[PDB]
Amino acid sequence: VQLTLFRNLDDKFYLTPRTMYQPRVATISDFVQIEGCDVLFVNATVIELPG
Amino acid sequence: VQLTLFRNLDDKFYLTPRTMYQPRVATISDFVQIEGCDVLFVNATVIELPG
Ligand SMILES: *[C@@H]1O[C@H](CO)[C@@H](O[C@@H]2O[C@H](CO)[C@@H](O)[C@H](O)[C@H]2NC(C)=O)[C@H](O)[C@H]1NC(C)=O
Ligand SMILES: *[C@@H]1O[C@H](CO)[C@@H](O)[C@H](O)[C@H]1NC(C)=O
């Protein structure tokens, strides 16, 4: 919960801390899969998902 | 070590915090592999291991 998720120009997902701006490439081990969604989530397909 | 491991009704492994009951599915990235076993470990086969 200490990381922020954003998107670069090429629409790749990146993570950064909030203490300093040190962006890194988001991988599949950085996420937890849950049943429901949210209205504030970003919509993406399996093609654009993190590797 | 802040998470508790348990089994759901379909014999699938789940992890939850001990501050609130917020269960989530356990993945292989959540585990550390060691040589030995204790007597209080659940017996399982490679087939029924977390995805
Ligand atoms: C997990 O399986 C192991 C392997 O069978 C069990 O260890 C055996 O325990 C019995 C008593 O229940 C002993 O008589 C055997 O000698 C043990 N075998 C070995 C190879 O150590 C273990 O008890 C099982 N654990 C659980 C929680 O069911
Ligand atoms: C995602 O799609 C849903 C419908 O499935 C829509 O209501 C929502 O506004 C979309 N969200 C974004 C961020 O585009």
- Give the alpha-carbon dihedral of A51, B8, B4, A26, to 10 degrees: 10
Which of B30, B8, B12 lies closest to B21, judged by CA? Answer: B8
| Partner B contacted by A32 (CB < 8 A) | yes
Residue with CA at minimum distance from ligand 2 atom 10: A43
Round to whole Å and give the CA distance between A48 and A51.
9
Beta-bridge partner residues of A13: A7
Where are the strands (E) in chain A, listed by range?
3-7, 13-17, 24-25
Handedness of CA A39, B29, A17, A2 (dihedral sign): positive
Round to whole Å and give the CA distance between A14 and A10.
11
- Rounded to 5 degrees, what angle do the CA atoms A15, B29, A29 make? 20
- Give the alpha-carbon dihedral of A39, A41, A46, A48, to 10 degrees: 130
Beta-bridge partner residues of B30: none
| Closest partner CB to A34 (pick from B24, B27, B29) | B24
Q: Is the CB of A43 under 6 A from ligand 2?
A: yes
Round to whole Å and give the CA distance between B19 and A49.
31
CB-hemisphere CA count at 13 Å for A34? 8
Is the CB of B29 less than 8 angstroms away from the CB of A29? yes
State the structure-solving technique: cryo-EM
